[PDB]
Amino acid sequence: QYSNQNNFV
């Protein structure tokens, strides 16, 4: 299982 989230402001 591979769960990824990224935020760029």
mmCIF file of N, CA and C in Angstrom:
data_model
loop_
_atom_site.group_PDB
_atom_site.id
_atom_site.type_symbol
_atom_site.label_atom_id
_atom_site.label_comp_id
_atom_site.label_asym_id
_atom_site.label_seq_id
_atom_site.Cartn_x
_atom_site.Cartn_y
_atom_site.Cartn_z
ATOM 1 N N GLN A 1 0.847 -1.233 0.000
ATOM 2 C CA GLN A 1 0.000 0.000 0.000
ATOM 3 C C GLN A 1 0.868 1.263 0.000
ATOM 4 N N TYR A 2 0.565 2.183 -0.922
ATOM 5 C CA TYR A 2 1.336 3.410 -1.139
ATOM 6 C C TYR A 2 0.333 4.559 -1.139
ATOM 7 N N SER A 3 0.399 5.407 -0.112
ATOM 8 C CA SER A 3 -0.484 6.556 0.027
ATOM 9 C C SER A 3 0.369 7.818 0.110
ATOM 10 N N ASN A 4 0.066 8.791 -0.745
ATOM 11 C CA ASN A 4 0.907 9.962 -0.953
ATOM 12 C C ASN A 4 0.017 11.180 -1.130
ATOM 13 N N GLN A 5 0.377 12.274 -0.467
ATOM 14 C CA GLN A 5 -0.310 13.540 -0.677
ATOM 15 C C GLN A 5 0.688 14.670 -0.422
ATOM 16 N N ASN A 6 0.709 15.676 -1.292
ATOM 17 C CA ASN A 6 1.604 16.816 -1.109
ATOM 18 C C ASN A 6 0.924 18.106 -1.543
ATOM 19 N N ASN A 7 1.257 19.179 -0.820
ATOM 20 C CA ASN A 7 0.682 20.501 -1.029
ATOM 21 C C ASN A 7 1.818 21.492 -1.261
ATOM 22 N N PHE A 8 1.716 22.279 -2.344
ATOM 23 C CA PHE A 8 2.691 23.312 -2.698
ATOM 24 C C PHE A 8 1.965 24.639 -2.832
ATOM 25 N N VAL A 9 2.322 25.587 -1.976
ATOM 26 C CA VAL A 9 1.780 26.931 -2.029
ATOM 27 C C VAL A 9 2.936 27.873 -2.342
#
